[PDB]
Paper text:
In the crystal structure of the M49K mutant, three regions around the substrate-binding pocket show conformational changes in comparison with the structure of the WT 3CLpro. One is the short helix (residues 45–51) in which the M49K mutation is located. The electron density of this helix in the crystal structure of the M49K mutant is so weak that its structure cannot be modeled, indicating that the M49K mutation destabilizes this short helix. The other two regions are the loop (residues 167–171) after M165 and the linker (residues 187–196) connecting domains II and III of 3CLpro. Both show slight conformational changes upon introducing the M49K mutation. Particularly, this mutation destabilizes the short helix of 3CLpro containing residues 45–51, resulting in alterations to the conformation of the WU-04-binding pocket and thereby explaining the resistance to WU-04. We purified the WT 3CLpro and the WU-04-resistant mutants and measured their inhibition by WU-04 using a fluorescence-based enzyme assay. Both the M49K and M165V mutations increased the IC50 of WU-04 against 3CLpro by more than 20-fold. The S301P mutant showed a significantly decreased dimerization ability (Kd = 17.81 ± 7.32 nM) compared to the WT 3CLpro (Kd = 0.94 ± 0.21 nM). In contrast, mutations M49K and M165V did not inhibit 3CLpro dimerization. In our cell-based assay that was designed to evaluate the self-cleavage efficiency of 3CLpro, the M49K mutation resulted in a nearly 20-fold increase in the IC50 of WU-04 but had negligible effect on the efficacy of ensitrelvir.
The coronavirus 3C-like protease (3CLpro), also known as main protease (Mpro), plays a crucial role in processing two polyproteins (pp1a and pp1ab) encoded by the virus RNA genome. In this study, we have identified mutations in SARS-CoV-2 3CLpro that confer resistance to WU-04.
Residue numbers in the entry:
A (entry chain A), B (entry chain A): 1 to 45, 51 to 301
């Protein structure tokens, strides 16, 4: 019983975190095999990064793994990440993949400062390709990930804070999520929407944990529900979403379109002072997978 | 910027988690130096635990650390925990302490099944000595902890789920938090209250992150505020609480008793459709320390 924002255990990622310094800029890097990955903006002091990097040498990069200095033997740029080749392969490299996630999907963030892990939390990639993280100065290069069996799938590297306080970054190939750039501009998050399939997943989590007051005998049609979704700035629900919710629908015996009728009622009338899983708002940062992982 | 429920990095605890089996009961143990700690109820099949343990031998305990079987060479009971002496000291033992926490304090939980860590999240010890965790069958023996510098302070070991779905357990000396027992009874959580100092800390976090709509020019007296606290089932605010909130008050320039006037207004009128740090409820599971750790 219970339902919490739950991160993956962070140990396998902790052993990959290092400190990268170039000039007076210090941030975090990810050390896998004999390569350290970090945001290329570490070499800034607008910019032409190819020019900036041509003017650097291996010795301009100080990489510290705990108390051990790692000698940089090569440097290159891949999109918005820097790859520093070091003379030592990380003995704690986990089995890993570089994956790009989709908006609506969740991942764990290991927030890090000066190469030292500080905390772990769960984030969702928002429809507008920002994340609502918790980052302070020095956190660039912190990574996001999911773990399956023994394999770490890295999906996010932190690069910047946008004016509204939300966060933007890249996949581990250095390609930004969303229409953001690692230079100084007036860039801002675009309009966002609520992740409908996740809200439904969380309502199923609530039912599994004994919250039933929002249930009703009605069922709606997919088309009728999607009219309501559009009105309340919710993402369209697809037949694939309905299919993905199948197992949760079966376990609870509440058909997906039956739960959609509950969600319509909640959107049109609110909660009348009640709560669901300890929240007075509809929660959209749990995927169906997240619910199945913790509720079963 | 941002404010998340954030756990400590769990790696140092992951390397201490083992599987303990006795009979047909499997649960988790904590392996520090050459001792494995686990709930004594693993030896159950009402009970007289001293009798149950006299009837056991070392060979009745199977301890598995990943793929390695650890040979049990001694067994004893300490309050509600079992101490299994094994022939191998854990090479990954961190610097650690066994500390008992107070209601209102927070800690990270490494939820574990079959000795395998599954996820990490933050919990608070409720005033009624339960925690609102996320645990499924098999999670007994999962631990709660805080980390300071390199030192793991273990404060909680999971033993049971109470009828309302909240959770009860012991410190690592085997002494229960709260009026709960590791036998079959109709025991239930007592009445709870809201942790006032934590609500105020979270309001300061909100101000630091730019939420100001609940602020006002008024200040209240400690006595007048505590009259309102009692009416809304909030814990009394003490001068020590005011002192602990000092640094956050200074950083924001909002005196504690000024923020107390905001909290009084919020309790008496609600939020009028607005939110604070993404919540439509007053959040009480962040301590002043938690706020200072993530906001600074």
């Amino acid at each position: 019983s219970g339902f919490r924002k739950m991160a993956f255990p962070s140990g396998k990622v902790e052993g990959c975190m290092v400190q990268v310094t170039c000039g007076t800029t210090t941030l975090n890097g990810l050390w896998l095999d004999d390569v350290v990955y970090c945001p290329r903006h570490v070499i800034c002091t607008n910019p032409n990064y190819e020019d900036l990097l041509i003017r650097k040498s291996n010795h301009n990069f100080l990489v510290q793994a705990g108390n051990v200095q790692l000698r940089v033997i090569g440097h290159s740029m891949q999109n918005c990440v820097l790859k520093l080749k070091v003379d030592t392969a990380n003995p704690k490299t986990p089995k890993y993949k570089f994956v790009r996630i989709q908006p609506g999907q969740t991942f764990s963030v290991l927030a890090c400062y000066n190469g030292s892990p500080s905390g772990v939390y769960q984030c969702a990639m928002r429809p507008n390709f920002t994340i609502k993280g918790s980052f302070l100065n020095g956190s660039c290069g912190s990574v996001g990930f999911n773990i399956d069996y023994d394999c770490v799938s890295f999906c996010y590297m932190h690069h910047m804070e946008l004016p509204t306080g939300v966060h933007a970054g890249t996949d581990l190939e250095g390609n930004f999520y969303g229409p953001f750039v690692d230079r100084q501009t007036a860039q801002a998050a675009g309009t966002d929407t609520t992740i409908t399939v996740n809200v439904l997943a969380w309502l199923y989590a609530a039912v599994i944990n004994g919250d039933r007051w929002f249930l009703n005998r009605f069922t709606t049609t997919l088309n009728d529900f999607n009219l309501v979704a559009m009105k309340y700035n919710y993402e369209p629900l697809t037949q694939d979403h309905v299919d993905i919710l199948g197992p949760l629908s079966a376990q609870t015996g509440i058909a997906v379109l039956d739960m959609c009728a509950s969600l319509k009622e909640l959107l049109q009338n609110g909660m009348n002072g009640r709560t669901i899983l300890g929240s007075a708002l509809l929660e959209d940062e749990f995927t169906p997978f997240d619910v199945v992982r913790q509720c079963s």
